[PDB]
Design a protein around this ligand. Structure first.
Ligand SMILES: Cc1cc2nc3c(=O)[nH]c(=O)nc-3n(C[C@H](O)[C@H](O)[C@H](O)COP(=O)(O)O)c2cc1C
Ligand code: SF4
Ligand code: SF4
Ligand code: SF4
Ligand code: FES
Ligand code: FES
Ligand code: NA
Lengths: 430, 44, 264, 214
């Protein structure tokens, strides 16, 4: 099909998204969780990884890597070391709150997803790393894990499948950088959340120096349904190579900020109007959208008219899908101050390990603060563009890249707005 | 059919400072024996 | 023999063992990659990013100190992308660095000064204020002026691995990350004075040596230590008929790159 | 402001009394057993967090105790305590108010919440009330942006706030009552206000749409 959207409730995965049904095991069973799990497990690693490959599912943490290929790096004979699945529940990207709802209302989807995914990789346990601020969610997830242990669904002889699996919850202590896949591993190991260089890759040398796959909560949570309902069903949504459903956070200047599950490649305009109640003051009041969370560049209103919300369509718009966290700014917004506060976030979140982000992001932050007042000259706009290109591609981890792109999105689409402030500031003093 | 008009995630209003680590303590009995690297530590 | 694999440094074939890094392959053709955090006798860190080098047909530059070479790679150590990576990284290092060279003991034998001359730009476009951090007192031998530190973590890796003292670390994060001990504490290992050599900048300097000499002045006399029976190879720096300081002289089979604090 | 060097004071020094209560020692050995044998430095972040839940904050003696209990070097515990922003290396109020001011919240007027809290408590961000019952700070995104503007007070989130709503929550805490986490706008969590636009139909039950041969 060429038109996407209007997902039906029968096709939705996260059926207790809004917490209107029981989130404990009794409710989860009624909604179809933990159904025929033993059958899925006994079909083996190769079959499970086949379903994920066929579905075309891609990473939901931000980078959108094909999940089935990534999870197959663990499909290798062991070397005497234990194997581990880490579930990334750090969820720290501004604008993103989708993983939070999964853990508090559908915790048994995640636990089963840990087992099915852990089995496919051949792992012995799952470590779920949840941000420390999500204390109530972390406690909901532990209650669900205890219920699954009591019901025999995890632990020794999981689901009666003669396969042992553990599900540990470890809490973070406040660092956005610990959502980066190798910084998360270091934080589990008791160190500062500083990312590792690659190689080695986690599937070779990971947590405790052992083969590891770090997967996003949303990636892990939808896997059991892909196995039950098949990869063909999941591949029936969204454009080719961008398939499946997706959770969207719409925040900022909308009438009804919300979280909603929708099909991939849905038009961005349709998503805001149908679910979020439209832009505050009408579609004509729209200024710019950040379509994938803070790390993705903003797009202007002209691009937003026809852009589809999937991985490839937003790449052609010079932005990215990211965490599918849509942030909306209407024409009353100070666009410069909005992006400057995002640079301020990245400056507060840099781990400090590597030079270009330790120094560069702090440098960009200071220049942006002067751009907000207009206390600069237009020759500095190209200077800031070059500085951001010196960070991008030159850092250990993608935080540095994610700090550069917001600046580039502002310079690309709102250069006249910056130059206009500089003109007003110069005449306001001269 | 479920009521699906009230909010059914209200247990967390009664959680306290040690709710998480009490569940972790309670969950120790179900865990499986951990693997060993062979040394008491990397020697600090 | 059979394990040796073929890589290319600017088109010249080199046969290297598996696990050899890109930085080490360039050494075999006599090309020294710029570096700050990398030191061959310490664990690889990969944090300074001064060693970023372009691999032909790959769009992302790789950290040469940490990246193992793959078969058939052609390492372009002087390509425009390599050169622009070095200029960008050098510019970041010098943004908050203090204008201290006249009063700094490292001046004239400084890897920051020299790799800036050879690989950095010739001017600054940084129009802000600079960071300034407070100084830590770690004993009578090592003076700290930590505003000059470039966060390379060489001292942390020396203290942990060579000296077996887990007292150095980083506190904070971001631009505010500080190298030190957090609490007031002395760094008094028998090998402690070697942090002065391996610190690439004037952040860690010799208290006894402070302000007495410049490196272009000194005459170097290669000699041996007699404070113990190890026979560590040293350099005796003299000026105008006076001994100024003692440096280690590399000898792989005796003292490698280090001396003891009595020797120093 | 917030320094990352420790300097001793009478109230915070290596001899400031700290120990884990016997109940909390049972909780430590459960934490440690979550990890492979010989990899118990992994327990630093939870154990260090437990010391703060017992104590409210972390003096240098509490960090020193964590290092001894886990037999890690103290500098490795200091590195952790200064990296992660949720560790309080100075004492905090009874209620640690944390207001998100990142852009998604800022667009929905987190500035008004911060202004109301300052004038109501009569302090500025980064300060503690003289009676030592509230500390006020600004924080980065707390992962609740659809429910903006919002604050965290200890372990609870209070969301969809207005200046009038935040004043009520402050009155409840002065009284001694627990306000109640969640949105203060009428909705229950993250649903669109004005009725669900999805998941209005009953869930489809076990076995629905299962592929054949499973
Ligand atoms: C600064 C930074 C923060 C990140 N934060 C998260 C996060 O909070 N949650 C997440 O699933 N991924 C996050 N990622 C992406 C992860 O590194 C990783 O790609 C992902 O968690 C695992 O792959 P997956 O999405 O395919 O499952 C972050 C990356 C960076 C550079
Ligand atoms: S890019 Fe920033 S967050 Fe990532 S490793 Fe480098 S300094 Fe740390
Ligand atoms: S460390 Fe080098 S560049 Fe820095 S002040 Fe000293 S001599 Fe100058
Ligand atoms: S003090 Fe010197 S050796 Fe230590 S991190 Fe700073 S620059 Fe590197
Ligand atoms: S020398 Fe390679 S990054 Fe420092
Ligand atoms: S921007 Fe405030 S909770 Fe995300
Ligand atoms: Na030095």
């Amino acid at each position: 099909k060429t038109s996407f959207g209007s997902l039906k409730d029968e096709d939705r995965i996260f059926t207790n998204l809004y917490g209107r049904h029981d989130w404990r095991l009794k409710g989860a069973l009624r909604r179809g969780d933990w159904y025929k799990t033993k059958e899925i497990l006994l079909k083996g690693p190769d079959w499970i990884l086949g379903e994920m490959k066929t579905s075309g599912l891609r990473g939901r943490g931000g980078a959108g890597f094909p999940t089935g290929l990534k999870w197959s790096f663990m499909n290798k004979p062991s070397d005497g070391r234990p194997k581990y699945l880490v579930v990334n529940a750090d969820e720290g990207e501004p604008g993103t709150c989708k993983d939070r709802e999964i853990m508090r209302h559908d915790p048994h989807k995640l636990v089963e997803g840990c087992l099915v995914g852990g089995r496919a990789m051949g792992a012995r346990a799952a470590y779920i790393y949840i941000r420390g601020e999500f204390y109530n969610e972390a406690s909901n997830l532990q209650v669900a894990i205890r219920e699954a242990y009591e019901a025999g669904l995890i632990g020794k002889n999981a689901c009666g499948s003669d396969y042992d699996f553990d599900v540990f919850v470890v809490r973070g202590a406040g660092a956005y950088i610990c959502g980066e896949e190798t910084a998360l591993i270091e934080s589990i190991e008791g160190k500062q959340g500083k990312p590792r260089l690659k190689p080695p890759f986690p599937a070779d040398v990971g947590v405790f120096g052992c083969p590891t796959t770090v997967a996003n909560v949303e990636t892990v949570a939808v896997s059991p349904t892909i196995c039950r309902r098949g990869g063909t069903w999941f591949a029936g949504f969204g454009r080719e190579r961008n398939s499946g459903t997706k959770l969207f956070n719409i925040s900022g200047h909308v009438n009804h900020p919300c979280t909603v599950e929708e099909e991939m490649s849905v038009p961005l305009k349709e998503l805001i109007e149908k679910h979020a109640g439209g832009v505050t003051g009408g579609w004509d009041n729209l200024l710019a959208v950040i379509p994938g969370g803070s790390s993705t560049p903003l797009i202007p209103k002209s691009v937003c008219e026809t852009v589809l919300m999937d991985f490839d369509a937003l790449v052609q718009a010079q932005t990215g899908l990211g965490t599918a966290a849509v942030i909306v700014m209407d024409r009353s917004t100070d666009i410069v101050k909005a992006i400057a506060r995002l640079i301020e976030f990245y400056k507060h979140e840099s781990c400090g390990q590597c030079t270009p982000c330790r120094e560069g992001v702090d440098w960009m932050n200071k220049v942006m603060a002067r751009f907000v007042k207009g206390d600069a000259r237009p020759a500095e706009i190209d200077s800031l563009w070059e500085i951001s290109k010196q960070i991008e591609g030159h850092t250990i981890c993608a935080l540095g890249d994610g700090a550069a792109w917001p600046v580039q999105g502002l310079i690309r689409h709102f250069r006249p707005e910056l130059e206009d402030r500089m003109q007003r500031f110069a005449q306001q003093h001269r | 059919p479920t009521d699906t008009t009230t909010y059914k995630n209200l247990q967390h209003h009664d959680y306290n400072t040690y709710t998480f680590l009490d569940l972790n303590l309670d969950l120790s009995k179900f865990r499986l024996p951990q693997p060993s690297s062979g040394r008491e530590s990397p020697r600090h | 023999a059979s394990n040796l694999i073929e890589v290319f440094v600017d088109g010249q074939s080199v046969m290297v063992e598996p696990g050899t890094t890109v930085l080490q392959a360039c050494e075999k053709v006599g090309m020294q990659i710029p570096r700050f955090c990398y030191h061959e006798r310490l664990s690889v860190a990969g944090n300074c990013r001064m060693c970023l080098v372009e691999i032909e047909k790959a769009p992302k530059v790789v950290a040469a100190c940490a990246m193992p070479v793959m078969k058939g790679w052609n390492i372009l150590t002087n390509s425009e992308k390599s050169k622009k990576a070095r200029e960008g990284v050098m510019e970041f290092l010098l943004a908050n660095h203090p204008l201290d060279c006249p009063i700094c003991d490292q001046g004239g034998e400084c890897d920051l000064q020299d790799q800036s001359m050879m690989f950095g730009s010739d001017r600054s476009r940084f129009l802000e204020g600079k960071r300034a951090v407070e100084d830590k007192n770690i004993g009578p031998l090592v003076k700290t002026i930590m505003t000059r530190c470039i966060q390379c973590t060489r001292c942390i890796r020396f203290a942990s691995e060579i000296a077996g003292v887990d007292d150095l670390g980083t506190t904070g994060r971001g631009n505010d990350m500080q190298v030190g001990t957090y609490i007031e504490k002395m760094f008094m290992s028998e090998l402690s004075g070697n942090v002065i050599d391996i610190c690439p900048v004037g952040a860690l300097t010799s208290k006894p040596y402070a302000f007495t000499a410049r490196p272009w002045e000194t005459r170097k006399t290669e000699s041996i230590d007699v404070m113990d029976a190890v026979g560590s190879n040293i350099v005796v720096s003299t000026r105008t008929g006076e001994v100024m300081r003692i440096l280690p002289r590399m000898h792989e089979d005796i003292n490698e790159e280090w001396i003891s604090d009595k020797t120093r | 402001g917030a320094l990352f060097v420790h300097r001793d004071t009478p109230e915070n020094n290596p001899d400031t009394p700290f120990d884990f209560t016997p109940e909390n020692y049972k909780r430590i050995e459960a934490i440690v057993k979550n990890y492979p044998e010989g990899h118990q430095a992994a327990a630093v972040l939870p154990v260090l967090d437990l010391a703060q839940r017992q104590n409210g904050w972390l003096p240098i003696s509490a960090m020193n105790k964590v290092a001894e209990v886990l037999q890690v070097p103290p500098m490795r515990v200091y590195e952790v305590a200064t990296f992660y922003t949720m560790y309080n290396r100075k004492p905090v109020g009874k209620y640690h108010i944390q207001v998100c001011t990142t852009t998604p919240c800022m667009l929905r007027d987190s500035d008004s919440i911060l202004e109301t809290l300052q004038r109501k408590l009569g302090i500025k961000v980064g300060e503690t009330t003289p009676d030592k019952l509230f500390t006020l700070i600004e924080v980065e995104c707390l992962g609740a942006c659809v429910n903006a503007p919002m604050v965290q007070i200890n372990d609870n989130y209070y969301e969809d706030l207005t200046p009038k709503d935040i004043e009520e929550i402050i009155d409840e805490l002065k009284a001694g009552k627990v306000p109640k986490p969640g949105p203060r706008s009428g909705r229950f969590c993250c649903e669109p206000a004005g009725g669900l636009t999805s998941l209005t139909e009953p869930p489809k039950g076990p076995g629905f749409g299962v592929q054949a041969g499973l």
